[model samples]
Target: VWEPQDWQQQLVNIRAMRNKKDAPVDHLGTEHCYDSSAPPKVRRYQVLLSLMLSSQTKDQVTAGAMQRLRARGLTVDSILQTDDATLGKLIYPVGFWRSKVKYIKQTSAILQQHYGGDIPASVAELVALPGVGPKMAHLAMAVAWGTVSGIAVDTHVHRIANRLRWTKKATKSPEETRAALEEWLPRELWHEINGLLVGFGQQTCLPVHPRCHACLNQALCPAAQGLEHHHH
Candidate 1:
């Protein structure tokens, strides 16, 4: 029932339409912080901090928080120097601000002591840092370091992958879906999948009442076809 090739073709079409002046990348903290224009080392650190604070928080909020922290000196030494309470206030309103204060501080110290204040270039090493997970590690490696080890499956990727039948069944977690997709997805597509699906999930294949009628992939999407048949 799943047509991976056909689905990929539709995705290529979707990718073309996704390019706009006001792109979602502009609003995403991870994308904003790991800016190509910034100094390479600076971008790497910013990516780590952005991803750390991004869990359960909106992009705009995360970006705002990052700006505030950067204004107040956003560096490994700066994080170590700033007191925990001050860091909490600087990164306020992000999800789990208090807990993240602990993570950020600990991770910063570890980087300074062990890695010479540079982000580890490997996903395994990155995840070993406090509060870092596979998703954040993969995203940081890809965006900041240009290294693509595997796909980063956030909620959007997990939901869209199942909706598109990329996985044989509904996965219990993003990690499960990541394993499933990696089994079939080409290595080159690993870095692009998360960003494409995240945008598509937000703008089209939403969790509730997705605009199936307007979706470019509606003709090829099994979920959309099933819904249409049910309605008829």
Candidate 2:
């Protein structure tokens, strides 16, 4: 297993290389409605909605959906006022667009009735919304509120953690991976892990035939050594 210092150094090197490469942006795009320039409340809602649409979807597609919503006034009141069919059309082509429209409206109604149309600052409250999960909740908290509840473990994180032996075995869910990472890593590192590993997973530690030879962590990664052996 690699030491924490080794892990830290690897992330740094990988991130530097990632900056030089054509990496796919994460679920949150550069010019979304939740940009740092947007109103605080607007940012919060955009982050929450964007994350809800991100599952099994590409960054560009999710961003496009958010753009359409913003054009139609993506406020709690607006979402509540729009019919499910219309909402689905606005966010069209996103994965499960119809179901997401239902959840979005449901969540908006709850926000208006319970929280005065404001996003709940806590992860538990965020996840309590329809169709929201730990990944979306954590990411929304981090991006919108600058709060870090725990590491946001998604597919990339789960796969890389197992390959790097950060966890003793493969995990079946993002929740399991998040728990393992919270226990294994320092609190300070939790916030950056998702973005760092995501870029790395996309460009280097891919799902099939990872570019182990070009990886900064190749010397410390067991999977890299195994691949070398299989090839030789």
Candidate 3:
């Protein structure tokens, strides 16, 4: 069964939201590098790499890491050529740069040797790559390959979907919530979700006092309409 349409109508208001931090303007560089014709594996790999770099870091910070990595040559062979210290320096702004650099190096080596330098488009294949988890794999499948193996549930997807009462649980873990979300939401909405809800979660339906009155989707939001801010 699909979740209610309330969020869809309300989500329109989110397009107007703009945050300097993780802003939409920063998306251009990524779009420029990863176009539609870019090999699915490459696009997916790049997206997954960005997600890996993104943990505990903002999008702008992640973008900076990605930019440097791209400048260093994003290909498996190119990434493999770079040492851990160099890679770490490239991705400095992102959280856990040292550990992430190690993973990136390990993952690039695996891709170069096993996958022939191409990112695997399949979810199973993607998960086998070092540092690529369910969330990253799902994004690779959805954004890069046009496959909808699963939803890409991040902190925003988790918190906002829960707040909208679309799912019953209040868990913070993305993997734990995936089954529930897949059960409730249709597969068609899977790809557009991260962008739409992430925008909403960051800008409007914040963890703090969300501007409920200014909300476009308030009419369909059970939590926003029925529960007070303190109840959340």
18 in model 3: Cα distance from truth in Å? 22
lDDT of 2 at 210: 87
Candidate 2: C-alpha RMSD to true structure equals: 8.7
Query: What is residue 29's positional error in candidate 3, in angstroms?
Result: 14
Off by over 4 Å in 3: 1-41, 149-232
List, residue by residue over 116-222, the lDDT tens digit for candidate 2.
Answer: 87888888999899999988887787777666767888888888888877765677787898877777676656765776788778888887788887677778776
Candidate 1, poorest ten consecutive residues by summed lDDT: 21-30
Per model, state how many residue pairs clash.
Answer: 0, 0, 1
TM-scores, all candidates, are 0.53, 0.52, 0.49
lDDT of each: 0.78, 0.77, 0.68
Error of 2 at 125 (Å): 1.4
Model 3 compared with the native: what TM-score? 0.49
Candidate 1 lDDT over 41-133, as tens digits, reads 776788899989999999889989988987776777888999998888888989999999999999999989898888998889988988999
**Residue 93 C-alpha lDDT in model 2:** 96
> Tens digit of lDDT per residue, candidate 3, span 3-113?
546655655555445323253523532243343345656666677677778678877787777777776567666777787777777889689888888888888777777
Residue pairs clashing, model 1: none
